[PDB]
Amino acid sequence: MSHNMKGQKKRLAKAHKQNTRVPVWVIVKTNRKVVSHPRRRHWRRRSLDVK
Amino acid sequence: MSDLSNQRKLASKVLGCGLDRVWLNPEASEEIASAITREDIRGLIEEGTIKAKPVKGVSRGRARALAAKRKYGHCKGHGSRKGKKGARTPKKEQWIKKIRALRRRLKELRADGALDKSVYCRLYRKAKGGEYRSVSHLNSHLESEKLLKKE
Amino acid sequence: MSSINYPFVTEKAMMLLDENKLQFIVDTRSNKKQILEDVEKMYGFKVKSVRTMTTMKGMKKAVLAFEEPEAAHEIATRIGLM
Amino acid sequence: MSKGTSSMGKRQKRTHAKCRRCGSVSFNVHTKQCTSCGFGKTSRMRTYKWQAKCKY
RNA sequence: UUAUGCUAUCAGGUGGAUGGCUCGGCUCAAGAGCUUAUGAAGGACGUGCCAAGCUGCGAUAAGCCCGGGGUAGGUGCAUGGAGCCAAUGAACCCGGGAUUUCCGAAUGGGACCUCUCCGUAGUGAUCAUUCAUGAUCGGGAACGCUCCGAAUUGAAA
RNA sequence: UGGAGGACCGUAAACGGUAUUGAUCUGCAAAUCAUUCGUGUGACCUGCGUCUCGUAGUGAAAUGCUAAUCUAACCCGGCA
RNA sequence: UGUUCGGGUCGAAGCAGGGCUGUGAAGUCCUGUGGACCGUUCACAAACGAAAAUCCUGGUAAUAGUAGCAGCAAAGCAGGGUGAGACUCCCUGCCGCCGAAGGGGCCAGGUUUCCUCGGCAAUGUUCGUCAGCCGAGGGUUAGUCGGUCCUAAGACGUACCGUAAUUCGAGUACGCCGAAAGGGAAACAGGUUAAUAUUCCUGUACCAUUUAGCGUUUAGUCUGACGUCUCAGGGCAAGCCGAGCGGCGUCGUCGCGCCGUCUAAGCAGCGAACCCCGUGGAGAGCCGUAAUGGCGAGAAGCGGGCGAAUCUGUAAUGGCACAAGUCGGCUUCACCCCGGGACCCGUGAAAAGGACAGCUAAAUGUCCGUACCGAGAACUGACACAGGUGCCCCUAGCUGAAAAGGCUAAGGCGUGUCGGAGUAAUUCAGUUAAGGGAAUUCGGCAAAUUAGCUCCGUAACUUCGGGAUAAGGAGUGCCUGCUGUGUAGACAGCAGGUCGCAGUGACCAGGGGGCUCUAACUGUCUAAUACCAACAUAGGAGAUUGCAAACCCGUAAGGGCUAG
RNA sequence: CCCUAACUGGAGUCCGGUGAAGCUUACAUUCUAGUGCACAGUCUAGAGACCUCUAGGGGGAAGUGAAGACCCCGUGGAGC
RNA sequence: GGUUUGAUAGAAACGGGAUGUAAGCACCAAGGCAACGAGGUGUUCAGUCCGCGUUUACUAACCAUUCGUUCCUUUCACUU
């Protein structure tokens, strides 16, 4: 239970909601040409350089 | 049944017991699996489908028997002693009880009038100096040398 | 600048209607005083208390407890929740 | 205690925080300076000619 | 039906060379050349009906207003669904405006932190002989001016 | 009686790291594990905070340590 | 590239194979494939020719279906489910692991891993329907818990001054920050969810300012506010025993064993020690303590005041199977209060805040954190890593000095490859071993011996402290009945009977001595080959300097030593 | 140790699943002698040798790991 | 090696062995007012056990597959 401030928690929330797959409708729109994403990650890896 | 693990965890939470204390009826498996909420788990608990198994303690009767024998003074010999004499009976505690007994005896004697102040001072210092083993020894010395103002 | 974004309609948020509380997604810049005054201006109901938390979506949620009975139901009906 | 993986388990803190000015995690928490952009040291942005090669 | 193998070719797999194509790069020439306290550049966070990145934008948030050109489609990279906008002339382009969170020269104080405290609502610092007012601060690919100033190396040391 | 001491024994509390020249040695580990050992009321051990650094610091001093780098760290530049 | 002349969807380049020519560099053609570009004359250019550089980048072999998936730690089995599929997912039972940590709480750190549903291409050292994985949705609520406030070592800003100059530099002045383990205004119990709960709901409280009224200083004091060791008294969480009551277990015989038998803050009441006040007058001395001690500079005794933890009532119609729910006793750490003593050699923080004059009634109490892990799978070491990471002022029964070791609760787990026919040889780690007993070996390395407690007894030498548990001997279990000390808990001791090869029966647990070298000793060290005789140490000696000093840092401004 | 034996658990061995890495110019069933940069599976002359697979300890491949840390040299460095 | 035309393995019983006299019951037991009572004696060379043998088909050695044919074919010594 490390204690974050408002901005630190906001940046963690941004990282969390960035950690999402590309939408299937986006894949359909791009015709399976944008399927990947540079901000995908896992929580148990090299940590965020955000906090 | 699918996983009853969620139901078992919720039931352990509702009963305040450990996870393995929770007993789920192996016949009412679909009845348990239908239970999703705390209220459903409480209903199963009240109707007996879910219950907390009895705690299996540690019985103490065969230690009570040994404690009774040790109170009587048995099962406590040299072959049973393993800590040092001093770890089993602290010397300050021994001295404290001895000196307090002697002091209370002298106080009661001076209160009831068997002991005047002049000899009381010397007897108190003798006791503080360890001349007397116990209240019985003190009384024996008093009766031997006639220190009590008998009447 | 309105602090109230919109009523928050999830299962737990709908559970507030039966205790006369109403949950809102609000501006994270604003505070409890601004949220209370803005809600009172918006719906004409006297607010008894405001509870606020920040989420991991970067949002701020406020549960408002009203003073008038049925005020939460009436605001939900006015919005279109009920 | 080994200077390698054993001593590397004591790494539960930081020497550099996120910089307000540049966003880089380079703000020294002791010297109160950003080693990337110079915030907390100068009103200007920290730049040196040796950050690139001599252009010839 | 001589296995395990060896050599050559053929068919297939893997792989991504070769060829062809290329909205990219590089170099040279000709132009043009400052900007910010009227709060810049840069960063953080937010902003899309389904939207995670980039890009744009700033709680009026892939955008709002006015004039001109353009005119029948539009809704970025990025033709997917469903809608919305557009003959009240949109989209787009040129010019001019508005909005423009927080940090940042950052400038009421503090900042561990991009927030927080007082709220007395904020000319932070240094200056300008009317104390009305005004100047400076940060940024800019290289170029320009002033000052401080090595060693490798060559001399075959 | 009293309860001192850089006192004693001793914990797989903590700290250290003797011997097995054991296991391991493309390891569980870019030095760890098992057994055996030293200190364990003090020049004690340790958290968090803070300060001292490159011809400089720190060092009960081995040229030890200063982010797996130390008889002058690391990054970039002089440098093709 | 200039220039001449051309070829191509009736199939260019490229690619695989082949025919012919040329000594050759190479050219041309044929077949297939391919789908849009390609050549040629004379000249001109170059980022122009690869088999090599422990060459670079990419791809991919042999090794090879091999090593590994074996110390963690006894690891699973039966039955029934689910599912297309089950050693591996779910339930029940049995059998097991940890049980002073592998459980509980939480710092830093992580950052959604938390909860629910749906999946199994990858991850998981096997599988997988499972999951910290994948996809979708949800979840963190505070005046009272922290931050926030205060200041600590010590930073940062402004000014001055220095500097060629600065974003550089010491000092001074003014500010400002600096502790989620220092100080600190205040909240408890129960319930509720799938996930939050001193935060939401119920009940019962409390604190701060501000406003209005009612009254006002005692003002400058006290508190906050303090080291190490040791000890007394009181209390208490936990623990234990007896009786009643209510369940469960056992039931071959017996009647035992286990669980429960509850109750917060707030409010009201009492107050132990210390201290103080009034009396008193105590010596051929009296009064005390565990101990030190106290006393005509006023003891004992007698009255009073001040003053704790805790306890008592109330908070009572809360939760419990609306099942009981009532009582006593013992002990009490490792927690709370209080007091004493010893040491100096570190003499052991500051400031905010609070108290001393407040009572009543309304309003206000913003902001941030709050899920979950906190580690043999949620941190860090590239990993679901046998390391490391704050630890707890956390831990139940028996044995026992004990938190050692063993066996068990509660709680957490069987969580990280299987099977297996002698499962050969060999190997890692263990048990035992005739007779000999260091003959082995560089060397008793390794292993073995001894081992607890009680009693007897204990040498040379010595700095008189020690050596010392020296050495060397004896006892030890169980049962029956007792004695002594003590308020008690308990402790010590005695008499008799008795079994075994063996009574500290397992667990735990020194082998000892003699003669030398060396360093006095405790301590420090080559993190990752050197724990030593090396370094340090106390002790001894020498040197400089009277302070605008000696010595040293800085270019300077000015500093360290030096609050000397 | 004379002088080893038996046994226990984990590996190994055999089976199911999963599944790397390191040596490699080529060929390769070798052995003796000679030759050769004087230390040859490949040269020369002999002698052997049917192939494949499994287990096993390591004789050899001057086995692998590594631009020798010993010595010298370099008008190469570093510290003292 | 055996495979019902059978003692190959197992069960049962017995022989031959290992250990040391089971549980319960009764009497005694130092003593205790009693409740109890370590232990002794009899029951009892008992109880428990046998990875050995014998006897004995009581269950299981059953049911089968496969080669000894190059396979398809009538390139046949065959048959719808």
Side-chain angles (χ1 to χ4, degrees):
Chain A
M1 279 165 71
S2 76
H3 312 85
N4 301 315
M5 303 294 309
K6 199 199 181 103
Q8 305 183 302
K9 182 180 175 184
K10 271 205 74 63
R11 296 197 302 273
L12 286 168
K14 179 179 179 180
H16 166 59
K17 62 188 180 182
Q18 281 180 349
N19 192 12
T20 314
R21 70 174 183 177
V22 183
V24 289
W25 64 264
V26 161
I27 288 154
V28 183
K29 181 179 181 210
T30 52
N31 189 23
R32 283 186 281 176
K33 191 181 292 182
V34 174
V35 302
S36 176
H37 169 207
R39 286 282 82 200
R40 291 305 302 272
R41 61 177 173 84
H42 194 237
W43 60 266
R44 184 151 54 168
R45 290 177 71 188
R46 194 271 314 176
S47 78
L48 299 164
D49 293 328
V50 171
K51 181 181 174 185
Chain B
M1 67 178 74
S2 278
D3 300 334
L4 298 190
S5 70
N6 289 1
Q7 292 84 334
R8 192 166 190 172
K9 171 80 180 273
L10 201 55
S12 67
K13 287 178 281 184
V14 169
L15 291 159
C17 75
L19 199 62
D20 280 326
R21 291 255 317 279
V22 169
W23 178 85
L24 309 173
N25 213 338
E27 290 88 2
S29 68
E30 300 298 325
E31 297 179 355
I32 293 145
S34 297
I36 291 166
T37 66
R38 296 260 187 148
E39 211 61 9
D40 307 336
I41 292 297
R42 284 197 278 271
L44 292 178
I45 290 175
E46 68 195 52
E47 65 183 0
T49 287
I50 297 190
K51 64 185 72 176
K53 294 189 289 293
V55 165
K56 59 179 73 65
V58 182
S59 70
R60 210 170 163 296
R62 75 187 76 91
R64 299 187 189 101
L66 195 69
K69 290 182 183 292
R70 263 184 163 85
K71 195 98 197 161
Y72 196 69
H74 297 165
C75 282
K76 193 172 74 70
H78 284 97
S80 297
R81 296 182 178 98
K82 182 169 285 294
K84 297 277 287 160
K85 171 258 290 181
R88 299 171 56 80
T89 177
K91 53 178 206 81
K92 275 189 70 72
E93 276 192 27
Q94 296 276 137
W95 166 252
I96 285 166
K97 74 178 167 138
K98 143 167 180 175
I99 195 64
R100 264 151 192 199
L102 301 157
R103 270 153 196 196
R104 84 180 74 256
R105 176 65 178 150
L106 296 162
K107 288 180 184 290
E108 75 198 32
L109 286 154
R110 185 167 68 179
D112 60 44
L115 196 68
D116 56 356
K117 64 190 288 184
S118 53
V119 69
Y120 170 85
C121 198
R122 290 185 290 112
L123 273 177
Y124 193 96
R125 273 301 172 81
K126 292 284 189 178
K128 200 266 183 183
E131 295 292 329
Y132 309 120
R133 296 187 301 271
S134 77
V135 184
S136 199
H137 202 188
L138 184 45
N139 296 344
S140 71
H141 276 285
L142 306 183
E143 58 90 19
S144 60
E145 62 189 1
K146 315 310 280 185
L147 299 202
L148 278 73
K149 290 177 63 169
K150 182 264 289 183
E151 64 184 1
Chain C
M1 182 179 286
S2 185
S3 65
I4 296 89
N5 290 355
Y6 53 94
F8 188 67
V9 286
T10 72
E11 297 175 32
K12 186 173 181 176
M14 295 327 288
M15 270 164 203
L16 297 175
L17 269 46
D18 294 331
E19 289 291 326
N20 204 14
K21 299 143 167 273
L22 190 62
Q23 194 176 9
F24 285 101
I25 296 311
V26 304
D27 197 2
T28 192
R29 290 197 292 252
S30 65
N31 52 63
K32 278 176 201 196
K33 298 179 184 293
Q34 285 169 325
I35 297 156
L36 185 140
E37 65 191 2
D38 275 355
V39 167
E40 285 192 353
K41 179 177 70 176
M42 194 178 323
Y43 304 117
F45 281 121
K46 185 170 173 67
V47 164
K48 179 167 70 178
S49 69
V50 174
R51 294 287 175 262
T52 192
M53 73 181 77
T54 291
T55 66
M56 209 62 189
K57 301 291 181 67
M59 298 186 289
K60 182 175 281 188
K61 300 193 291 182
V63 185
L64 282 75
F66 295 95
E67 297 190 359
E68 300 87 2
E70 201 79 36
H73 290 283
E74 296 185 358
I75 294 183
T77 299
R78 188 181 299 116
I79 303 302
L81 281 67
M82 315 209 306
Chain D
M1 296 179 73
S2 174
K3 39 193 192 209
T5 73
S6 177
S7 70
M8 292 175 183
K10 275 168 199 223
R11 300 164 90 247
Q12 327 284 342
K13 62 189 75 66
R14 65 181 61 86
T15 174
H16 295 95
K18 186 100 152 154
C19 181
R20 269 181 274 155
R21 188 151 96 183
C22 67
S24 178
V25 179
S26 306
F27 197 88
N28 200 298
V29 304
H30 307 295
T31 71
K32 315 298 205 223
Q33 302 180 347
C34 183
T35 64
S36 178
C37 72
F39 181 65
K41 178 182 179 182
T42 175
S43 64
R44 309 164 172 203
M45 308 282 308
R46 179 252 194 188
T47 56
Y48 300 93
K49 292 294 181 182
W50 50 257
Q51 286 174 352
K53 287 182 178 290
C54 303
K55 299 299 181 183
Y56 63 86

